[PDB]
Amino acid sequence: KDIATPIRTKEILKKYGFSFKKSLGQNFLIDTNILNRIVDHAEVTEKTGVIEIGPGIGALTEQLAKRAKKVVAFEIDQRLLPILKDTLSPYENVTVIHQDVLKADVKSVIEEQFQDCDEIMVVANLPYYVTTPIIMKLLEEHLPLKGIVVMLQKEVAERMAADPSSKEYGSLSIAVQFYTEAKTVMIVPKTVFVPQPNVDSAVIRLILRDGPAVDVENESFFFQLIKASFAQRRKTLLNNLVNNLPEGKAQKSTIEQVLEETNIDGKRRGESLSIEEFAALSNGLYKALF
């Protein structure tokens, strides 16, 4: 049987369950069809190089290996790596890196690992608390990736893919869509996981854009500005800028003046700004504040 079946996963966890500490939000996929559907949505073929993050006991890694040219899995826990040497032993095209993807130089790994591939995808099942930090880290690294297809919490996907008119729109939406075209593609039933989460979760497809969605002087300042602006959503933009930028209180009157100079009423709520406005605002504030 495949790793992604309830009988095989149960057996592996029974054999090796005392050999690793269960972590925050850790689960194990036990439905082969769902995985292959996710792999369909990622468009993985014989020429695709796939990066997986957090391979678990190999469930998804296995389905990827059967379809991709090659699979590189990041795993921080050596105890889990020891388990994959059992569960992934049939697959030559799987290379496991004992490294935290957040600390990794992913561009070199890709050069090192994917020479015989035509396109690189990220495909991974991510626990809530690392979802946003991993995705932004990867996107800020400007990697030569076609796309990222990730299993995550439904609300997080919805936020990432939100369009400007919808209620889910926030700083996360803007940050992800700066880099990518984002769409939530499946709702995954709770029953494909061990242990089982309380609710259905989701899969998000992020296709990387040819270049940035808007023109900014400093990407990092732009993302800090967005974050600062949405911190207390219902309060005014000016108020948010004052209390959430380290420059806020020290340079209030400059901030006021940059809003005036860019024709953006600081009495408006942060959520009312388009991405084009936030861009123009970041550029003005970056030049005036540093």
- For the domain 213-290, what is the CATH code? 1.10.8.100
Structure tokens at 124: 């991974």
Count CA atoms within 13 Å of residue 218 on its CB side. Answer: 15
Q: Give the C-alpha separation, 162 to 141, whole Å.
A: 23
User: Could you please report the per-residue DSSP string of 12-32?
Assistant: HHHHHGGGS---TT--EE--H
Q: Give the C-alpha separation, 284 to 183, whole Å.
A: 31
CA 240 and chain centroid, separation: 26
Q: Give the C-alpha separation, 254 to 281, whole Å.
A: 12
Count other C-beta atoms under 10 Å from residue 54's C-beta: 23
Q: Give the C-alpha separation, 120 to 100, whole Å.
A: 19
Three-state SS at 158: helix
**Helices vs strands, H then E, count in the chain:** 12, 9
Q: Give the C-alpha separation, 54 to 50, whole Å.
A: 13
Q: Look-up: residue for tokens 């020891």?
A: 82
Q: Give the C-alpha separation, 171 to 269, whole Å.
A: 13
Is the CB of residue 130 less than 8 Å from the CB of residue 156?
no
Closest CA to 61 of 91, 99, 33: 91
Quickly list H helices, 26-76. Answer: 32-41, 59-65
- 195: cis peptide before it, omega within 30°? yes
Sorted by sequence, the CB contacts under 8 Å of residue 189 that are 6+ apart come out as 34, 200
Binding residues for S-adenosyl-L-methionine: 27, 29, 54, 75, 100, 125
CA 64 and chain centroid, separation: 18
Count other C-beta atoms under 10 Å from residue 144's C-beta: 12
Binding residues: 27, 29, 54, 75, 100, 125
| Helix %, strand %, coil % of the chain (to 5) | 45, 20, 40
Q: Give the C-alpha separation, 31 to 87, whole Å.
A: 16
Region of 43 on the Ramachandran plot (φ > 0 left; ψ -120 to 50 alpha; else beta): left
Q: Look-up: residue for tokens 């700066």?
A: 178
Three-state SS at 56: coil
Closest CA to 55 of 26, 32, 34: 26
- C-alpha Rg value of the chain to the nearest Å: 21
Go through 159-180 and write b for each residue having 16 or more CB atoms within 10 A of its CB, e for each that does not: bbbbeeeeeebbbbbbbbbbbb
User: Could you please report the per-residue DSSP string of 239-269?
Assistant: HHHHHHSTTTTTTHHHHHHHHHHTT--TTSB
Q: How far is CA 228 from CA 25, 98, 221, 258, in A?
A: 28, 35, 10, 16
Where exactly are the structural domains of the chain? 1-212, 213-290
